[PDB]
Design a protein around this ligand. Structure first.
Ligand SMILES: CC(C)(COP(=O)(O)OP(=O)(O)OC[C@H]1O[C@@H](n2cnc3c(N)ncnc32)[C@H](O)[C@@H]1OP(=O)(O)O)[C@@H](O)C(=O)NCCC(=O)NCCS
Ligand SMILES: CC(C)(COP(=O)(O)OP(=O)(O)OC[C@H]1O[C@@H](n2cnc3c(N)ncnc32)[C@H](O)[C@@H]1OP(=O)(O)O)[C@@H](O)C(=O)NCCC(=O)NCCS
Ligand SMILES: Nc1ncnc2c1ncn2[C@@H]1O[C@H](COP(=O)(O)OP(=O)(O)O)[C@@H](O)[C@H]1O
Ligand SMILES: O=P([O-])(O)O
Ligand SMILES: [Mg+2]
Lengths: 1019, 96, 95
């Protein structure tokens, strides 16, 4: 939205960025004063404060300050301090606003005559930016709209200096015409380049010395932040002058700012007995309106809403705030909580309600004490079960909760709660032949469209192709009932258009950042006649440019910031109407005689429900979007509906603000609109905060001949009355009802509602990545680091699912280190080298080498462990073992070395042997093996226990005697090959080492020399 | 799930997509051609490769040529990078 | 060994590639002298996603613990981290 900025913020930007030949005086000469101002510091930073006389005024978005005696003019710094003494921190009432005077601005006094005061203003409208000038500026300007010289600068148009001089500066003094023209020109370029929507300088002073910007009021289009962040900096948008936020309001504001969801709360009367917790911006207004209409205006405690799919936690935090706020003091008649909403689009109603249910359980004591009664009305996916959890919390706590669905009129719970009623361009855009291109990767939206098409008994799907710039061209799988079909996905829009000339509609899901460009691009393809812009947040200035191009090319724009629309039996724009169950519930698979137009998307879903229950159904419905400048207006669509023979009556859901609704009065008067029109404007309550009011518009429409209900409650009744009269007069001939084709439930959805069970094909027990934290065998990753596990520790968790002793972990790490490498001559290293040299990648080279590990290479650790365990466990003494092996013609695994002997030991074995003796509680198998070594070395001195044998038996001793494993567990781990894992993991380092080395050494292809090959072929 | 799918009450999109072979039938199918037809039509290794790799019934010369390629590329001694590794590996007591 | 290799052979491109890819991408961008915002837009224009950016569930309010653990060690013990500083600035833009 367009947001106001402080005078200081505006002046700072102006001084920093305005480009003009005109010398702007007193640049950056302002000082800000608050109740926390350190005057010594202020003077240190602004020594000019003593150089000349000053002017002081509040900068809090207070208008007409001079007339309120809030401008201290021509004062010394002492005089300024004296002026602030009674004002700074004081409460002030300006009209109907009461707040404190907290923020002031000090600037140098500019001596000038009243003749030297001018008025300049620039402001945005749908058709462009108006530039206003007046030679009689100041605090006595009056009705500037009629008095001042004015000029419209169109969309994408340049401000010609000759025009400024000729039309705007007619009454300006001749000598000041060139300087003024130069300034105004620079000001306009500044206004455009920094995305302002409003800029006013009253007064602008031009003396013999130069230009002085005495006052500045401005609004920027806040949505342009993504463009302007660099120039704007940490721009602050002040709230209007008045009371400051309660701590609860500040809390909700913080939640809203930190999430993609909308969470709003404003306290009206903290001591009021009527509290509202309504879902949706549209519905919140409607409920507030109904409460006021039933006399509850003085008892209404708050205005708020929650929307945009908030989490259960966010919903809980929102709800607890409301519940806390309403249980502060008792009311003689008790209190009411209205938990309302329209029909939810895709969000499971049970999810947000779980958060609310949790808050109610926590506040059950105070809620019973304060005699609180809760009224619930909500629709949407699985709302039936969401209403069940609400009814159940009422029973279990004892709190009275009255739960209602879509069958109840949205606003009926209000009358029940208060005890008034008992508690029980082109005319046609879409056809059944319409084919569209979806810009973006929106699988759910496309599938949604395709299910609507199927159920409408369409011959072909409405989505022809998709455009997604990040992937290459491919085909995506979708469902045509229960049959799988393929939809093409294009990288380039040019290709999509070329291959699909039948497409005339484009649905644009581009983000607010790329929506402009992708829409402008689409308009270069003449086949596209209708564009739906979904994105909320496009800067106003850009939408205006889109409008201009669309208008000149005859393209109908639906949006921006819209869900779209729906033409039952023909076409549905993306996400309009939501899930199939809602399309079926509101009979949107077949057309009726009623056409509608709304601003609000949420209210369009409610209108579908209302119309379906009261009439023969919806013919066509459109949500024009919520942006300042919609691509297509209420009138645009009303005229289409007037000109469509199938439309027998029109429903318009208007809003406070704007004068669009008056074009309808005019159309009726002129005899252009002859069809019955039902209209209700929302925001009749907003006058408790002139032609633009909902109350004024509703009166004008009723006088013009439009069917206007008393309130939103009577909207259903009035629609039904108009309909019945049209049937009675033969204008409507309702058609016999045909059942729609049936489509199967989605597995994802069925599993969510717990309707079906499907057994898992897999089973795991080492790691869980699904959580808020990664879990390794029961221990969360943070604990792994906190407890200083190390690689050894992590290996214990993933391989054995055990928290091992520190000495065991250190031993595992030690094994990985000694097995890391053993030169390039070994079988595995050789293959990795050969492989790396043959130009392969790391993984191929490593695997090529690893695949040699197992028997004659790397096998010995497992073999030794198994052999010695068998012998030990069998109870044979070491000498018996040695001889048994000799007789069987077998050598002992883990015995022998090429050079190393009993007198010249192997260092790796020494390192390990020593650690093991020192830290292992018991080493029986190692003891046995060392005794076998005593025998073999007594034969040949080099028949030592080698590193493979050492690791093997040490590892067995570690498993058996560390105390983390049962014997069964220790024996299974050996058998399943845990020891092979050690060697493989260990050596993998060495092999990656060699791979990198060969690449770094830039080694060429290897071919084995023929001289080393003995060819013994047949003859 | 098995039952709900049988009665067509629920739909679940397939994670996988294939188009070369169908083992589900009475007979094995290679790219639309049943295994008995493959033999009856005397396709050969070349012919079968045409169906599985290109999903096409190739001319006889094409099949014969593919077979010819496979024959000349069969071996080129033990000095080459690949043969060498396989030999080293076999010698290190590994499986086929 | 067969079971391990069968799995390892999937590592490289779409699975496990990101480490290498991110390091390469960010180094290039940093070393080329382009500022983080210029980088972000360059990638968008080229139709490329940033490697090492994005998560399925984890957000700017709900952090990844593994990233937290590592960031904190690096901040504490690395004498200089200019590329990490650059990457964190890119993250400020994308989030
Ligand atoms: C318009 C709407 C439907 C879709 O918006 P969305 O999901 O936020 O948008 P996207 O899916 O296009 O992604 C947002 C951005 O993240 C970018 N992005 C995503 N993953 C990325 C990655 N790994 N590296 C870099 N950028 C990445 C996309 O390029 C896109 O950039 P853009 O905004 O400049 O086009 C939605 O905002 C809406 O409902 N609006 C109301
Ligand atoms: C006799 C001679 C030829 C061979 O002796 P050697 O190398 O020590 O003997 P071996 O190669 O058979 O190995 C010794 C033992 O180690 C054993 N052994 C080897 N590796 C083993 C392993 N990994 N696990 C278990 N046992 C192992 C062998 O089974 C053999 O056992 P054995 O003595 O019970 O048969 C040699 O000692 C020699 O040349 N001697 C000189 C004698 C001389 O002076 N001659 C006269 C000239 S004047
Ligand atoms: N620094 C200044 N030097 C001289 N006159 C000033 C100065 N600032 C304001 N004024 C005078 O004070 C009047 C009121 O201030 P202004 O900023 O226009 O407040 P507002 O329009 O809200 O009453 C101006 O119309 C102008 O005559
Ligand atoms: O907030 P909505 O009512 O426009 O959806
Ligand atoms: Mg003024």
């Amino acid at each position: 939205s367009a947001k106001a900025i402080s005078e200081q913020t505006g002046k700072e930007l102006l001084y920093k960025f305005i480009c003009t030949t005109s010398a702007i005086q007193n640049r950056f000469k302002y000082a800000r004063v608050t109740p926390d101002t350190d005057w010594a510091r202020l003077l240190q930073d602004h020594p000019w404060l003593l150089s000349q006389n000053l002017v002081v005024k509040p900068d809090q978005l207070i208008k007409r300050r001079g007339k309120l005696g809030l401008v201290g003019v021509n004062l010394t710094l002492d005089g300024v301090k004296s002026w602030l003494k009674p004002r700074l921190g004081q409460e002030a009432t300006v009209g109907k606003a009461t707040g404190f005077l907290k923020n002031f601005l000090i600037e140098p006094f500019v001596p000038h005559s009243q003749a030297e005061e001018f008025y300049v203003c620039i402001y945005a409208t749908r058709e462009g930016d108006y530039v206003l000038f007046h030679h009689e500026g100041g605090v006595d300007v009056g009705d500037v709209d009629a008095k001042a010289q004015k000029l419209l600068v169109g969309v994408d148009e340049k401000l010609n200096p000759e025009d400024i001089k000729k039309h705007l500066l007619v009454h300006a003094p001749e000598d000041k015409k060139e300087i003024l023209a130069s300034f105004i020109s620079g000001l306009f370029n500044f206004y455009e380049d920094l995305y302002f929507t409003y800029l006013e300088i009253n007064p602008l002073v031009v003396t013999k010395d130069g230009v002085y910007v005495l006052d500045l009021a401005a609004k920027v289009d806040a949505t342009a932040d993504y463009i302007c962040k660099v120039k704007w900096g940490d721009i602050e948008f002040p709230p209007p002058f008045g009371r400051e936020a309660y701590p609860e309001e500040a809390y909700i504001a913080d939640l809203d700012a930190k999430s993609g969801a909308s969470l709003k709360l404003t306290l009206l009367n903290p001591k009021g007995r009527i509290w509202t917790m309504v879902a949706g911006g549209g519905a919140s207004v409607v409920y507030s309106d109904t409460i006021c209409d039933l006399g509850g205006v003085n008892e209404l405690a708050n205005y708020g809403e929650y929307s945009g799919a908030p989490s259960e936690q966010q919903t809980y935090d929102y709800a607890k705030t409301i519940l806390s706020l309403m249980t502060r003091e008792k009311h003689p008649d008790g209190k009411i909580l209205i938990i309302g909403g329209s029909i939810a689009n895709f969000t499971n109603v049970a999810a947000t309600f779980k958060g609310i249910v949790r808050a109610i359980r926590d506040y059950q004591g105070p809620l019973k004490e304060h005699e609180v009664t809760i009224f619930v009305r909500r629709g949407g996916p699985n709302y039936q079960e969401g209403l069940r959890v609400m009814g159940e919390v009422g029973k279990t706590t004892g709190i009275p909760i009255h739960v209602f669905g879509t069958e109840t009129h949205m606003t009926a719970i209000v009358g029940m709660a208060l005890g008034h009623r008992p508690i029980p361009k082109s005319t046609t855009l879409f056809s059944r032949h319409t084919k569209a291109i979806v810009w973006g990767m929106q699988t759910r939206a496309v599938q949604g469209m395709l299910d609507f098409d199927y159920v409408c008994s369409r011959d072909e799907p409405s989505v022809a192709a998709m455009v997604y710039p990040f992937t290459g061209d491919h085909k995506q799988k979708f469902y045509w009932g229960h049959k799988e079909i393929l939809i093409p996905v294009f990288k380039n829009m040019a290709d999509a258009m070329r291959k699909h000339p039948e497409v005339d509609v484009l649905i644009n899901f581009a983000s607010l950042r790329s929506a402009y460009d992708s829409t402008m691009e689409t308009m270069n393809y003449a086949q596209i006649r209708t564009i739906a812009i979904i994105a909320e947040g496009i800067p106003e200035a850009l939408t205006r440019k889109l409008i201009k191009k669309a208008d000149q090319k005859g393209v109908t724009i639906i949006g921006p910031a819209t869900v779209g629309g729906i033409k039952p039996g023909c076409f549905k724009i993306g996400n309009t109407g939501g899930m199939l169950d809602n399309i079926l519930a509101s009979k949107l698979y077949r057309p009726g005689s009623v056409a509608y137009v709304s601003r609000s998307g949420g209210m369009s879903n409610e209108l579908n429900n209302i119309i379906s229950r009261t009439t023969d159904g919806v013919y066509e419905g459109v949500a024009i979007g919520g942006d300042r400048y919609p691509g297509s207006t209420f009138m645009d669509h009303v005229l289409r509906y007037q000109d469509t023979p199938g439309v027998k009556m029109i429903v318009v859901l208007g809003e406070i603000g704007g004068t669009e609704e008056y074009k309808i009065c005019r159309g009726i008067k002129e005899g252009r609109l002859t069809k019955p029109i039902v209209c209700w404007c929302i925001g009749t309550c907003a006058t408790m905060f002139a032609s633009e009011t909902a109350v004024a518009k509703n009166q004008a429409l009723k006088e013009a001949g439009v069917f206007v209900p008393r309130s939103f409650d009577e909207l259903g009744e009035i629609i039904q009355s108009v309909y019945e009269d049209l049937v009675a007069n033969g204008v409507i001939v309702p058609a016999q009802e045909v059942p729609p084709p049936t489509v199967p439930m989605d597995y994802s959805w069925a599993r969510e509602l717990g309707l079906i069970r499907k057994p898992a094909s897999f089973m795991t027990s080492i790691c869980d990545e699904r959580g808020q934290e990664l879990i390794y065998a029961g221990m969360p990753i943070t604990e792994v680091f906190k407890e200083e596990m190390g690689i050894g520790g992590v290996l214990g968790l993933l391989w054995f699912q055990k928290r091992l002793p520190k000495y065991s972990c250190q031993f595992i790490e030690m094994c990985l280190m000694v097995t890391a490498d053993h030169g390039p001559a070994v079988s595995g290293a050789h293959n990795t080298i050969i492989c790396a040299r043959a130009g392969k990648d790391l993984v191929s080279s490593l695997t090529s080498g690893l695949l040699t590990i197992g028997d004659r290479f790397g096998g010995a650790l497992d073999a030794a462990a198994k052999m010695f365990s068998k012998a030990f466990d069998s109870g044979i003494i070491p000498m018996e073992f040695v001889n048994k092996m000799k007789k069987e013609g077998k050598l002992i695994m883990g015995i022998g070395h090429r050079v190393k002997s009993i007198n010249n030991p192997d260092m790796r074995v020494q390192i390990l042997k020593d650690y093991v003796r020192q830290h292992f509680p018991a080493t029986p198998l190692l003891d046995y093996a060392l005794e076998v070594e005593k025998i073999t070395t007594s034969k040949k001195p080099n028949l030592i226990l080698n590193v493979d044998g050492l690791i093997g038996v040490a590892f067995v001793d570690m498993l058996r005697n560390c105390g983390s494993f049962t014997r069964e567990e220790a024996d299974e781990y050996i058998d399943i090959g845990a020891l092979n894992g050690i060697f493989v993991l260990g050596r993998s380092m060495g092999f990656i080492g060699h791979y990198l080395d060969q690449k770094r050494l830039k080694q060429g292809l290897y071919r084995h020399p023929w001289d080393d090959i003995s060819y013994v072929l047949p003859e």
